[PDB]
């Protein structure tokens, strides 16, 4: 397996797994949520992202080693089932190998040059989040140190950002409790389902 | 190399916009094309029988011939170093009236009548049109209040 220097800066167009590729092996990440998936919304208020600084390609294999390095640290200190790690970007980009000498000039040179599939990597934009854990608010200094250990397994530069939302929802943490309180948000497991005031009135009659 | 076939680059442009498929509206056939009418070419994909080529889709020509179901249109084609006044037979569903001269025909109409309005009234109305002049020296009014101080917001991620 070639170094991650070789399959770095996003050069080719996205070349995804479909009926045109048909021969690309499996990603080393196959599971993506590893804390307690069963949690509700109010059990883990704060969340913490690690944010990309540059536009590059992360391998599926580097995302495997990253979440393991974060899963291991947080069961040491926050304890098991006291967190919810979620790796957010998925590998869909197929890299190729022009696998020469399959010490000789004998196979070809660059004659038939288009490669066989070699693995899957993930195209990342600037400011896009990679990993996201969510815990109690008592565990804030364990958020960063989990993701600080996870950032040494990625190429390039990442910044770790404690977010301003409530959990893995999209609503702000200062006014969530004030606004889930009356009607506007209902909790269904690990997320929050917004209800507007423009549907049919019978679901408002089912509420209250 | 690149397969010199008719209907080659048209995965999208001989196709309907979306949710207007099905059989064509009938006013397209109840259109009146005489000689010298400026028409433009937009070939559909429902009628197979007379679609022009992918070279004329979006060009605009001039009718020289009208027949039972189609119209001869003389268009200009950019071939390499020169252009060619080329004539094509196109069925009637693939074209329409270009509105491009109808905003000239209105002015000529309301231009000549306004020209003889200056003969009876005696003026110098200057019917030739002009581009946008620089803005006139006008006057703003900040009545009562005072202007709003805005300043650049700080950076938060």
């Amino acid at each position: 397996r070639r170094p991650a220097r070789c399959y770095r800066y996003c050069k080719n167009k996205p070349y995804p797994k479909s009926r045109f590729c048909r021969g690309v092996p499996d990603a080393k990440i196959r599971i993506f949520d590893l804390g307690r998936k069963k949690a509700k919304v109010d059990e883990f208020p704060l969340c913490g992202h690690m944010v990309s600084d540059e536009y590059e390609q992360l391998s599926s294999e580097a995302l495997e080693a990253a979440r393991i390095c974060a899963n291991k640290y947080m069961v040491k200190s926050c304890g098991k089932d006291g967190f919810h790690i979620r790796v957010r970007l998925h590998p869909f980009h197929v890299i190729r190998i022009n696998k020469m000498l399959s010490a000789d000039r004998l196979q070809t040179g660059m004659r038939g040059a288009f490669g066989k599939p070699q693995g899957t990597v993930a195209r990342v934009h600037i400011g896009q989040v990679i990993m996201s854990i969510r815990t109690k608010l008592q565990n804030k200094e364990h958020v960063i140190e989990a993701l600080r250990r996870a950032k040494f397994k990625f190429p390039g530069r990442q910044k770790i950002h404690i977010s301003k939302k409530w959990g893995f929802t999209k609503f702000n943490a200062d006014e969530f409790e004030d606004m889930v309180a009356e009607k506007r948000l209902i909790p269904d497991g690990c997320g929050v389902k917004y209800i507007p005031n423009r549907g049919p009135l019978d679901k408002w009659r089912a509420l209250h | 190399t690149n397969t010199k076939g008719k209907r080659r680059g048209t995965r999208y442009m001989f196709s309907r916009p979306f949710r207007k498929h099905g059989v064509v509206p009938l006013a397209t056939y109840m259109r009146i094309y005489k000689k010298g009418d400026i028409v433009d070419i937009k070939g559909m994909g429902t009628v197979q029988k007379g679609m022009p080529h992918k070279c004329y889709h979006g060009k605009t020509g001039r009718v020289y011939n009208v027949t039972q179901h189609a119209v001869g249109i003389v268009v200009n084609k950019q071939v390499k170093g020169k252009i060619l006044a080329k004539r094509i037979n196109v069925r009637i569903e693939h074209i329409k009236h270009s509105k491009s001269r109808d905003s000239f025909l209105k002015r000529v109409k309301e231009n000549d009548q306004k020209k003889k309005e200056a003969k009876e009234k005696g003026t110098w109305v200057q019917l030739k049109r002009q581009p946008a002049p620089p803005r006139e020296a006008h006057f703003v009014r900040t009545n009562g209040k005072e202007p709003e101080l805005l300043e650049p917001i700080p950076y938060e991620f």
């Binding site: - | 001869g72 003389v74 252009i83 004539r87």
Partner: protein
């Protein structure tokens, strides 16, 4: 002994070196390719307008 396949580099500037031209649309375009039944009537309209017309034309004109 491989060569270069196809470019259009330098080709656009030698088109405009002599100035790509409009085709010189000139008054009275010809009737080439107009459908014959319309065309066969119209010259019957031409070979009878000089002959049997001009005594009952100028007195109206």
């Amino acid at each position: 002994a491989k060569s270069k396949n196809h470019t259009t580099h330098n080709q656009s500037r030698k088109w405009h070196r002599n100035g790509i031209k409009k085709p010189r649309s000139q008054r009275y375009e010809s009737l080439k390719g107009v459908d014959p039944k319309f065309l066969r009537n119209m010259r019957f309209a031409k070979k009878h307008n000089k002959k049997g017309l001009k005594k009952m034309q100028a007195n109206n004109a």
